[PDB]
Design a protein around this ligand. Structure first.
Ligand SMILES: Cc1cc2nc3c(=O)[nH]c(=O)nc-3n(C[C@H](O)[C@H](O)[C@H](O)COP(=O)(O)OP(=O)(O)OC[C@H]3O[C@@H](n4cnc5c(N)ncnc54)[C@H](O)[C@@H]3O)c2cc1C
Ligand SMILES: CC(=O)c1ccc[n+]([C@@H]2O[C@H](COP(=O)([O-])OP(=O)([O-])OC[C@H]3O[C@@H](n4cnc5c(N)ncnc54)[C@H](OP(=O)([O-])[O-])[C@@H]3O)[C@@H](O)[C@H]2O)c1
Length: 531
C-alpha cells in the first residue's frame, strides 16, 4: 500500500487523521495515512470496553466540516456509546472514500528530516520507507496505554485486560472474581458493567476522582430535526467559547454567593447532570477557597449516595482541587457500591505490594481473582510521539528536546523540526476543550498553512526558537494563575513514573487560542520562518 513519495504523510486515522486526509484532498495535495489499527476510529476503535461512552454531548462531539454529514447523521442519546461513535466514524470514512488513502496494520517507527531536500523520510514496522514534504502527527493524546507499575504482572495466571486495548469479541465475566485497578473515567464506566456479571468485583482505588451524574437520556428526534435547521450556526456558537461547547459561563464568583444561593445553584447542575457545573462560577479553577466550596458540595452528594458511611468516606476525593483532574461523568457508579458483591479496596490506606499468580496483594491482604482489568490510563500527550524515533535538524531527537516537558510554538510545531505538525497536543487547548472543536481548528490551520506554502512555492516551514520559548513561558505562566499545576494528573505527566511534572496544555480557552492562531496566520505565519 503506502506510496513512495507524497506531499503530506499523516500518522493516525482517528478523528484528526481522517479530517486531515479529507481536507488535504480537497486542497489538491497528495496525502496518505498510516495507522496501527486494522480500521478507522482511533480511541473509538481501541476502547471497546463495556460502558465506553463520550462525556461531551453527542450533538457537540461530532464533525462540522460537512453539512451533509450534519443533516443526515442521527445521534440517539445525550451521550453516544462507543459502538455508536464508531458507526459515525465509519459513516464519515465511507462517504468521503477515505480508506483508499490509508495503510492499516502499520506502525510508524522512525522519521528523520533531510535538510538537503527539505523532506521527511518515514519508516514503518513493515519496512516501508516514505518520503513526504510534510509530516502531520495525528497520533492522539490518549493513545498509548499505561500499565500500572507493579511487580508480578506477568505472573498473574488469570486473564488480564487494559481498557485502552479491549478485546474485539465481548468478554464474559459471569461468575468470576474480578479486579479493576483504576477509577478515572475508564474505571468509572467499565466497573458498573462488570459488577452485573461478576461473582465479586474488587475496585482498587488510589486517589478518588470527582464524578457527577451523567443523566444520560434518549435524544428527542424533534429536537434533532430543529437542531439540524440551524446546525452550522449552533456549532459557531460552540467555537466562540473557552470550552468548545454550549456550557453556561457562570459570571459570579463562588466566593461572593451566600451558602444557600450556592447550594440552590449547584443542586440545579447536579439534577441536570453533565459537566457544566465546572463553569458555574468564574473562579472554581482560579481560587482554592472558591474551589473548595464547590468541592464540599460534591463531596457531600457522594456521602449521601453510599449507605455504608465508611465506604462512602473512602470514595470522597481529598487532597486536590475539584476539576483539576478531568471531571468524570458517572452512571450508577456510586450506587454500585451499595451492592453486596462490590468491594472498594482503598489502596491509599493499603497500598498494593504486588500482583501474584492468584490476584492482588496489598499490605493488608490477598485478593484472589480470575480476571484483572487495568483502567490505568495512558502515557498522555507525548506517549505516542515518544514511541517514534523522530529526528530533526542536526539529528536532534524529539524525545530529548522534550525530555523536561513538551516545547512547542502554539502546540503546533517545535523549532529544530521543520515541516512537522502535531494535532491537538501539548501547548494547545487539546483535551481542555471538546476535542472535536480543538481537532477541527488544528487540522484546518495546518492544512491551510500547507496549501499556503505550495501556493507560494515555499518548501520549508519552521518555528523560530525564541517564539517557541516565549510560547512555553506563556503556557506555563497562564497555567500558574489556575489550580491546574497543583495536581498530579495526566495533564501534568503524573500518569508515568519518571515523566517530568509539567502542566502540558494551553488553559486560556479555545476561543482565545483560536484568535491567536488566526492572527499568526494573517500576518503570514509570524514566529515561523518560511523558505
Ligand atoms: C476512551 C476515551 C474517550 C474519550 N471521550 C472524549 C470525550 O468524550 N470528549 C472529548 O473531547 N475527548 C474525548 N477523548 C479524547 C480523544 O483523544 C479525542 O476526543 C479524539 O478522539 C482523539 O482523536 P485523534 O485522531 O486526535 O487521536 P486518536 O483517536 O487517539 O487516534 C490516533 C491514532 O493514531 C494511531 N497511531 C499512534 N501512533 C502510531 C504510530 N507510530 N504509527 C501508526 N499509527 C499510530 C493510533 O493507533 C490511533 O488509532 C476520549 C479519549 C478516550 C481515550
Ligand atoms: C466518558 C469519557 O468520555 C471517557 C472515558 C475514558 C477516558 N476518557 C479520556 O481519557 C482520560 C484517561 O481516562 P482514564 O480513566 O483511562 O485514565 P486516568 O484518568 O489517567 O485514570 C487512571 C486511573 O488509574 C489509576 N492508576 C494509574 N497508575 C496507578 C498505579 N500505579 N497504581 C494504582 N492506580 C493507578 C489512577 O490513580 P491516581 O491515584 O489518580 O493516579 C486513576 O485511578 C480521561 O481523563 C478522559 O480525558 C474519557
Amino acid at each position: 500500500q503506502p506510496p513512495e513519495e507524497v506531499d503530506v504523510l499523516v500518522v493516525g486515522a482517528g478523528f484528526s487523521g481522517l479530517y486531515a486526509l479529507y481536507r488535504l484532498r480537497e486542497l489538491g495535495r497528495s496525502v496518505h495515512v498510516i495507522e496501527t489499527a486494522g480500521d478507522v476510529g482511533g480511541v473509538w476503535y481501541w476502547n471497546r470496553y463495556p460502558g465506553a461512552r463520550c462525556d461531551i454531548e453527542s450533538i457537540e462531539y461530532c464533525y462540522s466540516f460537512s453539512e451533509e454529514v450534519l443533516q443526515e447523521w442521527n445521534w440517539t442519546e445525550r451521550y453516544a456509546s462507543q459502538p455508536e461513535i464508531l458507526r459515525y466514524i465509519n459513516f464519515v470514512a465511507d462517504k468521503f472514500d477515505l480508506r483508499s488513502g490509508i495503510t492499516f496494520h502499520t506502525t510508524v517507527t522512525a522519521a528523520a528530516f533531510d535538510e538537503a531536500t527539505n523532506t521527511w523520510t518515514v519508516d514503518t514496522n513493515h519496512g516501508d520507507r516514505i518520503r513526504a514534504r510534510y509530516l502531520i502527527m495525528a497520533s492522539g493524546q490518549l493513545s498509548v496505554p499505561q500499565l500500572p507499575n507493579f511487580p508480578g504482572l506477568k505472573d498473574f495466571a488469570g486473564n488480564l485486560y487494559h481498557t485502552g486495548n479491549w478485546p474485539h469479541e465481548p468478554v464474559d465475566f459471569s461468575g468470576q472474581r474480578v479486579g479493576v485497578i483504576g477509577t478515572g473515567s475508564s474505571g468509572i464506566q467499565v466497573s458498573p458493567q462488570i459488577a452485573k456479571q461478576a461473582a465479586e468485583l474488587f475496585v482498587f482505588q488510589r486517589t478518588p476522582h470527582f464524578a457527577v451524574p451523567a443523566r444520560n437520556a434518549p435524544l428527542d428526534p424533534e429536537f434533532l430535526a430543529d437542531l439540524k435547521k440551524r446546525y452550522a450556526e449552533f456549532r459557531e456558537e460552540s467555537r466562540n467559547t473557552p470550552g468548545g461547547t454550549h456550557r453556561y459561563q457562570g459570571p459570579k464568583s463562588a466566593l461572593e454567593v451566600s451558602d444557600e444561593e450556592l447550594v440552590e445553584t449547584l443542586e440545579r447542575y447536579w439534577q441536570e447532570g453533565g459537566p457544566d457545573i465546572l463553569a458555574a462560577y468564574r473562579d472554581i479553577l482560579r481560587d482554592r477557597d472558591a474551589n473548595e466550596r464547590v468541592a464540599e458540595f460534591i463531596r457531600n452528594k457522594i456521602r449521601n449516595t453510599v449507605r455504608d458511611p465508611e465506604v462512602a468516606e473512602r470514595l470522597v476525593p481529598k487532597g486536590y482541587p475539584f476539576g483539576t483532574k478531568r471531571l468524570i461523568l458517572e452512571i450508577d457508579y456510586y450506587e454500585m457500591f451499595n451492592r453486596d458483591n462490590v468491594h472498594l479496596v482503598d489502596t491509599l490506606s493499603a497500598p498494593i505490594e504486588t500482583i501474584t499468580p492468584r490476584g492482588v496483594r496489598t499490605s493488608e491482604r490477598e485478593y484472589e481473582l480470575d480476571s484483572l482489568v487495568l483502567a490505568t490510563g495512558f502515557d498522555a500527550l507525548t506517549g505516542a510521539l515518544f514511541k517514534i524515533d523522530i529526528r530533526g535538524v542536526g539529528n536532534v531527537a524529539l524525545k530529548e528536546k522534550w525530555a523536561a516537558g513538551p516545547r512547542t510554538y502554539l502546540g503546533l510545531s517545535t523549532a529544530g523540526f521543520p515541516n512537522l505538525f502535531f494535532i491537538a497536543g501539548p501547548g494547545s487547548p487539546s483535551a481542555l476543550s471538546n476535542m472535536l472543536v480543538s481537532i477541527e481548528q488544528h487540522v484546518e490551520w495546518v492544512t491551510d498553512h500547507i496549501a499556503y506554502m505550495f501556493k507560494n512555492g515555499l518548501t520549508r516551514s519552521e518555528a523560530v526558537l525564541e517564539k517557541e520559548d516565549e510560547w512555553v513561558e506563556h503556557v506555563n505562566e497562564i497555567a500558574d494563575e489556575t489550580l491546574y499545576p497543583m495536581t498530579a494528573s495526566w495533564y501534568t505527566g503524573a500518569n508515568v513514573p519518571g515523566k517530568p511534572r509539567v502542566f502540558m496544555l494551553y488553559v486560556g480557552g479555545f476561543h482565545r487560542y483560536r484568535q491567536i492562531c488566526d492572527e499568526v496566520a494573517a500576518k503570514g505565519y509570524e514566529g515561523f520562518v518560511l523558505t
